[PDB]
């Protein structure tokens, strides 16, 4: 994101279950076109409810929320930021404080 307020904008689509502009946008490059009824290009999801909002944005895609997918994303958390190979600018843990407290002040709204 270009800001932390964009992280607020994105978590205010995640916590509702909606797809952002960027959350649509990364997949239009990263997942190019396969067929629509068979042989669908398949992404793994950790959240089920966003799955319909993903499939609205993408017709030709298989959106999987499974325990194997949960194990894959859990293991990605397990080996953390090290699967980014330099691309993780900064650290996750400094971002989590600002994201949790800012989203908290967004929801309590004082």
């Amino acid at each position: 994101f270009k800001g932390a307020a964009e992280a607020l904008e994105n978590a205010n689509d995640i916590s509702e279950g909606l797809v952002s502009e960027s959350l649509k946008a990364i997949l239009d490059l990263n997942l190019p076109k396969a067929s629509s009824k068979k042989k669908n290009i398949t992404l793994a999801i950790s959240d089920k409810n966003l799955g319909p909002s993903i499939k609205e944005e993408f017709p030709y895609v298989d959106c999987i929320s499974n325990e194997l997918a949960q194990d894959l994303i859990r293991g990605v958390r397990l080996h953390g930021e090290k699967l980014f190979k330099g691309l993780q600018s900064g650290d996750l843990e400094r971002a989590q404080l600002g994201l949790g407290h800012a989203y908290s002040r967004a929801k309590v709204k004082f």
């Binding site: 978590a11 995640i14 916590s15 279950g17 950790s46 959240d47 089920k48 409810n49 994303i73 859990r74 990605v76 958390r77 397990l78 953390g80 996750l92 989590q96 404080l97 994201l99 949790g100 407290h101 989203y103 908290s104 929801k107 309590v108």
Partner: peptide, 23 residues
């Protein structure tokens, strides 16, 4: 305190805050 971060989300769907904690 810097350790504390709270969530205001209902934990009946903990994947609603799934990016906000990892591992």
């Amino acid at each position: 305190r810097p350790n504390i971060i709270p969530i205001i989300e209902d934990a009946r769907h903990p994947q609603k805050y799934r990016m906000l904690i990892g591992m």
